[PDB]
Design a binder for this molecule. Structure first.
Ligand SMILES: Nc1nc2c(ncn2[C@@H]2O[C@H](COP(=O)(O)OP(=O)(O)O)[C@@H](O)[C@H]2O)c(=O)[nH]1
Ligand SMILES: *C/C=C(\C)CC/C=C(\C)CCC=C(C)C
Ligand SMILES: OC[C@H]1O[C@@H](O)[C@H](O)[C@@H](O)[C@@H]1O
Ligand SMILES: [Mg+2]
Lengths: 178, 187
């Protein structure tokens, strides 16, 4: 600490570097691809945000491909004291994402009560969708912990890009929805 | 009872002895003829504390030219081998300056093993003679151990890939760190 972000470099520039170093050519081939796509699409597209829980009646999902405004109009219930992971499903199209991470500010009536962030990591472009699981964590419980919360979620990377920003609502009850 | 799969990534300054360390442990032979810049992903069977383990070995390119590409190997890492060279005190200086910042950034909770390579050159006279001209000397074990606790590593180890001495004890400690993990979430 502190960590300085990598210098800007396109994938083409990378493959040109040490062009005839077979051990290094295989190394790049190992990490990068064997990728073409519409140049008019964002290099990174986070698709879904899934709640993974053993206790949950069914997997819960945040579709980040539609109108993000809708999540203010609704709430998401989470049974207190359960342990869970978060599955982040994203896609990379043209260039390397350098250290993409997930920032989550949890407010309660305009009061910041929690700040969590997960390092999703660095990913090159490919056709198949990517997937990142947070380590196992557990929701709080008690009369204080129970209640309604207001969440501001954000996806960024080492280049200070905001790939996605949206707010939504979380309610912690004694039991699940059903 | 099925073999446990753990991911090992090795980072550190260029030409500090990463690739040779991997090849030696993998194939039980130091490569004197040809050494790749980066070693292909080798999966090595290894048994520690009565536990069968399949150890996936990931070599990296420590060059600054790949400061953006190299981190692609980091996800799903279970244990990391942060390396420096005993004969290069400059390489040791990069441990808290370049490598610990990067590893802790991309691999937040992955256990770190600080490795001191080429320890056969510690009492080598040619090396000492060359280092003397920079008011420098080989790294002392105390210096390495100090740095390890400073960067909050799981443990300090030194080895000599050329003599194969210490290599085993490293990857055993690395496997041990990989085989283990209050409360976390959103309190
Ligand atoms: N004396 C000594 N030399 C070594 C040892 N390991 C590697 N070397 C030499 O130092 C150089 C290190 O190369 P390499 O391992 O590929 O470096 P890296 O992969 O870039 O970190 C090679 O030329 C090796 O011959 C060692 O344990 N002792
Ligand atoms: C206090 C922080 C809370 C527990 C975060 C809760 C939500 C997950 C992260 C993501 C999935 C939410 C379901 C789709 C409802
Ligand atoms: O979604 C990723 C986006 O990050 C921005 O910084 C770039 O300007 C875009 O080219 C890229 O598509
Ligand atoms: Mg090498």
């Amino acid at each position: 600490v502190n960590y300085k972000p990598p210098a800007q470099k396109s994938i083409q520039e990378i493959q040109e570097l040490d062009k005839d170093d077979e051990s290094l050519r295989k190394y790049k081939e190992a990490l990068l691809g064997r990728v073409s796509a519409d140049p008019n699409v964002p290099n990174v597209v986070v698709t879904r945000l899934t709640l993974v829980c053993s206790t949950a009646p069914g997997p819960l999902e945040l579709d980040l491909t539609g109108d993000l405004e809708s999540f203010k109009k609704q709430s998401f219930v989470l049974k207190e004291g359960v342990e869970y992971r978060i599955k982040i499903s994203f896609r990379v199209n043209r260039e390397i994402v350098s250290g993409m991470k997930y920032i989550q500010h949890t407010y309660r009536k305009g009061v910041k009560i929690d700040k969590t962030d997960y390092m999703v990591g660095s990913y090159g472009p490919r056709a198949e969708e990517y997937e990142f699981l947070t380590p196992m964590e557990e929701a709080p419980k008690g009369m204080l912990a129970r209640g309604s919360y207001n969440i501001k979620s954000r996806f960024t990377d080492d280049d200070r890009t905001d790939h996605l920003s949206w707010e939504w609502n979380l309610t912690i009850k004694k039991e699940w929805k059903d | 009872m099925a073999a446990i799969r753990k991911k090992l990534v090795i980072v550190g300054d260029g030409a500090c002895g990463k690739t040779c360390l991997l090849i030696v442990f993998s194939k039980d032979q130091f490569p004197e003829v040809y050494v790749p810049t980066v070693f292909e992903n080798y999966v090595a069977d290894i048994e520690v504390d009565g536990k069968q383990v399949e150890l996936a070995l990931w070599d990296t390119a420590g060059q600054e030219d790949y400061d953006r590409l190299r981190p692609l190997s980091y996800p799903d890492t279970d244990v990391i081998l942060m390396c420096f060279s005993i004969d290069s005190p400059d390489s040791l200086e990069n441990i808290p300056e370049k490598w610990t910042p990067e590893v802790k950034h991309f691999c937040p909770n992955v256990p770190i093993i600080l490795v001191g390579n080429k320890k056969d050159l510690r009492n080598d006279e040619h090396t000492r003679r060359e280092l003397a001209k920079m008011k420098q000397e080989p790294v002392k074990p105390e210096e390495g151990r100090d740095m390890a606790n400073r960067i909050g590593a799981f443990g300090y180890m030194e080895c000599s890939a050329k003599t194969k001495d210490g290599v085993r004890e490293v990857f055993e400690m690395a496997t041990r760190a990989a085989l283990q993990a209050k409360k976390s979430g959103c309190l």
